[PDB]
């Protein structure tokens, strides 16, 4: 109500999120930033987006018997890829890198000998 | 459990980098050895 | 929990393969010196 038929589906403890709209129509399609990527056939009413760890985003729109309705966008941040940047790990960074490259240099020094 | 994941990915990046450096050292070593032999 | 455990398993496997590679490189350098 308010030309805001699109509504994100919540209360799912699993690794997946869903969205839905309250509209009755036949052979509905979906728009991703206005482009034709989405499609809905019969016997299915709630569309599936994907897992929350895949970082989905973009615009999403629903419409029915009414004309082109008013879309909305979603944003996610669950990364499972972020790395620590505090002083407790960059020191390890530098120690490991310097030790390894020093060992490398010692090896190449000895290699540059007999020939 | 978030801290464990952060440390885990940091270590994974560390070890990928170390693999890259070991690969380059193997490359120079095998080039020199195949040249000498 | 599911994604974290594979991250730990992968980092362990990669550490093992690192040890194997460093053993290889030590062997090659030693052979070229002999």
């Amino acid at each position: 109500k308010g030309n805001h038929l699109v509504k994100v589906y919540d209360y799912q403890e699993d690794g997946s999120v869903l969205l839905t709209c309250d509209a009755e129509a036949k052979n509905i399609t979906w728009f991703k930033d206005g482009k034709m990527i989405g499609f809905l056939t019969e016997d299915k009413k709630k569309w599936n987006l994907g897992s929350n760890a895949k970082d989905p985003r973009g615009m999403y729109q629903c419409k029915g018997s009414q004309n082109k309705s008013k879309p909305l966008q979603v944003y996610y941040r669950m990364c499972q890829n972020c790395i620590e940047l505090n002083a407790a790990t960059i020191s390890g960074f530098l120690f490991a890198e310097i030790v390894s490259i020093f060992v490398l240099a010692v090896g190449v020094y000895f290699i540059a000998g007999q020939d | 459990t978030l801290l464990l994941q952060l440390t885990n990915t940091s270590a994974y990046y560390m070890y990928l980098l170390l693999l890259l450096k070991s690969v380059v050292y193997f490359a120079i070593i095998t080039c020199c050895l195949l040249r000498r032999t | 929990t599911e994604k974290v455990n594979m991250m730990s398993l992968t980092v362990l496997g990669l550490r093992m393969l690192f040890a194997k590679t460093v053993a290889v490189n030590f062997l090659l350098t030693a052979k070229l010196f002999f």
């Binding site: 407790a88 390890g92 060992v103 | 270590a11 | 030590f26």
Partner: peptide, 27 residues
């Protein structure tokens, strides 16, 4: 704990390399 594990691994790895060097020298 992973920090301690990695530190111990690195220290023991360097010790292994230096002892391999010393052993291969004495052969």
């Amino acid at each position: 704990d992973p920090k301690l594990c990695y530190l111990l691994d690195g220290i023991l790895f360097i010790y292994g390399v230096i002892l391999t060097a010393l052993f291969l020298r004495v052969k």
